[PDB]
């Protein structure tokens, strides 16, 4: 999972660089401004793995 996450992070960085180049400016400020609520949330699940 660490190897896969590194590969996915590289791919996401490349995609973000391409998007920024296409837009002509950094969308970081706009994203920070539009950070009123988080669309992605994580809920813990008490899985029973072995004992």
């Amino acid at each position: 999972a660490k190897q896969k996450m590194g590969r996915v992070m590289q791919t996401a960085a490349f995609s973000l660089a391409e998007v920024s180049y296409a837009t002509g400016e950094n969308i970081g400020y706009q994203v920070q401004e539009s950070v009123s609520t988080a669309r992605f949330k994580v809920r813990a699940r008490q899985e029973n793995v072995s004992g």
Binding site: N48, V49, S50, G51
Partner: protein
């Protein structure tokens, strides 16, 4: 034992005496010994209890000249369920093998409350042969004992590591333990099971396993009976 000696040796028949309450006999020996002004032995019992029990037990056995036999099943009553007790200790020394009746089995179910883990017969290999009974008896009995031990281990392990985490060889072993303590050992007080019928039922229980799981049984027996 005198009647058994008569019948078996001067009549050429098999006897199988069943002496009951060897603990009661030992208490009687205690009272007879202490009436002669003799100091008690370890647990109050006379010191020569080993000699007396040896006479009573070794009064059994086969002889070359005669076609009869004297088998013996001296049924003891262990005080406080202690094997270190003198009567069980001396009886285990003199006799060969032992059959245990279990309080846990009695509480859990019905006759007979006999557990196979601590119970064994020392001359079993002679009785379970090829010409006598069936040629699969030894393999089936060894397999049943091993899988009963594994079933007890799995029953203890389920409450520790969860039911799901148990392996296939542990879940099947737990199922075998259930069907073993509930159908094979469990016998009506009046129903008669021949040795061949008992071995057939043992195979019926052992068939819940894959043919590869049964390791103690010889490959020829597995191919012929399974």
């Amino acid at each position: 034992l005198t009647t058994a000696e008569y019948l078996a040796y001067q009549t050429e028949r098999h006897v199988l005496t069943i002496l009951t309450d060897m603990s009661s006999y030992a208490d009687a020996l205690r009272e007879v010994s202490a009436a002669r002004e003799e100091v008690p032995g370890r647990r109050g019992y006379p010191g020569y209890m080993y000699t007396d029990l040896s006479t009573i037990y070794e009064r059994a056995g086969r002889v070359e000249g005669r076609n009869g036999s004297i088998t013996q099943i001296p049924i003891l009553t262990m005080p406080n369920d202690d094997i270190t007790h003198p009567i069980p200790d001396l009886t285990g020394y003199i006799t060969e093998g032992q059959i245990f009746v279990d309080r846990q089995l009695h509480n859990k179910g019905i006759y007979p409350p006999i557990n196979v883990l601590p119970s064994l017969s020392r001359l079993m290999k002679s009785a379970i042969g090829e010409g006598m009974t069936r040629k699969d008896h030894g393999d089936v009995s060894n397999q049943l004992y091993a899988k009963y031990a594994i079933g007890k281990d799995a029953a203890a392990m389920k409450a520790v590591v969860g039911e799901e985490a148990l392996s296939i060889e542990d879940k099947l072993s737990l199922e075998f333990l259930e069907k073993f303590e509930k159908t094979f050992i469990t016998q009506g007080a009046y129903e008669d099971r021949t040795v061949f019928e008992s071995l057939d039922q043992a195979w019926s229980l052992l068939r819940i396993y894959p043919k590869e799981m049964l390791n103690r049984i010889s490959p020829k027996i597995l191919d012929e009976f399974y």
